[PDB]
């Protein structure tokens, strides 16, 4: 919890924070064509289903990369415009112990490592290599859930648990201060 070194934020199932890719070298409107994505974070949970993170514009047509707990295991999913790929971890996540997650994508190639497992790798189908996004990022849940009807129920399920030390594209997130949607703040 935010009361001893690492500030850990609690998520109650309705909690979700919006952030914007506000840190650089990791104008006006338009979009971004990202070659890569890098996510690192630690979570603590008893949940067997839940959306951890969603990066993308959040429209039905939009590209996305997301982390979710699906049937007790963290998985990464992304669709860059040539259909999605899923990378599924082998580490039970719902132990209620702080667990590290490292997930990244370079063009079509993805990697997911929970704890000390051998990284799970895979690639989205040949074609698109860039994630077209406005830079929006949601943690613990999502505003626009309709863009989850095409996915496992976990993606429409708010995360219940705690999160700390979130690093997005080489920048440590200030979970409380960086949040843009005035969420209800609770510590772990």
CB 6 within 8 A of CB 157: no
Give min distance, CB of 181 to Ca ion, in A: 25
Residue 113 annotated as part of some ligand binding site: no
Nearest one of 74, 51, 73 to 157, comparing CA atoms: 51
Nearest one of 116, 136, 111, 110 to 21, comparing CA atoms: 136
Which CB atom, from 18 or from 63, has the smaller least distance to Ca ion?
63
**Count of residues that interact with Ca ion, criterion CB under 5 A:** 6
Under rule CB under 5 A, residue 72 binds Ca ion: no
Close Cβ partners of 113 (under 8 Å, ≥ 6 residues apart)? 89, 101, 102, 103, 119, 120
Position closest to Ca ion via CB: 81
Residue 178 annotated as part of some ligand binding site: no
Give min distance, CB of 63 to Ca ion, in A: 5
Close Cβ partners of 123 (under 8 Å, ≥ 6 residues apart)? 85, 108, 109, 110
Handedness of CA 170, 125, 90, 68 (dihedral sign): positive
Task: Find the part of the chain contacting Ca ion (CB under 5 A) among 79-87, 88-96, 118-126, 180-188.
Answer: 79-87
Which CB atom, from 56 or from 141, has the smaller least distance to Ca ion?
56
First to last CA, the chain: 4
Could you say which of 80, 103, 114, 142 contacts Ca ion (CB under 5 A)? Answer: 80
Under rule CB under 5 A, residue 79 binds Ca ion: no
CB 183 within 8 A of CB 17: yes
Span 115-134, contacts to Ca ion by CB under 5 A: 128, 130, 132
Structure tokens at 38: 């890098």
Give min distance, CB of 77 to Ca ion, in A: 14
Give min distance, CB of 3 to Ca ion, in A: 41
For Ca ion, the binding residues (CB under 5 A) are 63, 80-81, 128, 130, 132
| Annotated binding residues for Ca(2+) | 63, 80, 130, 132
């Amino acid at each position: 919890k935010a009361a001893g070194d690492a500030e850990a934020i609690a998520f109650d199932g309705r909690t979700y924070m919006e952030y914007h890719n506000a840190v650089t070298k990791s104008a006006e409107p338009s979009e971004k064509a990202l070659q890569s994505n890098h996510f690192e974070l630690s979570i603590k949970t008893e949940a067997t289903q839940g959306l951890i993170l969603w990066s993308g514009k959040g429209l039905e047509r939009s590209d996305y990369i997301a982390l979710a707990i699906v049937d007790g295991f963290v998985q990464m999913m992304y669709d860059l415009g040539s259909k999605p790929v899923v990378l599924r971890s082998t580490v039970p996540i719902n132990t209620n112990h702080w667990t590290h997650i490292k997930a990244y994508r370079v063009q079509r190639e993805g990697s997911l490592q929970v704890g000390n497992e051998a990284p799970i790798t895979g690639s989205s189908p040949l074609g698109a290599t860039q994630l077209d996004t406005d830079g929006a990022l949601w943690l613990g849940g999502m505003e626009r859930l309709s863009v989850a009807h095409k996915l496992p129920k976990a993606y429409s399920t708010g995360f219940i648990g705690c999160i700390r030390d979130v690093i997005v594209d080489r920048q440590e997130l200030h979970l409380v201060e960086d949040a843009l949607n005035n969420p209800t703040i609770l510590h772990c």
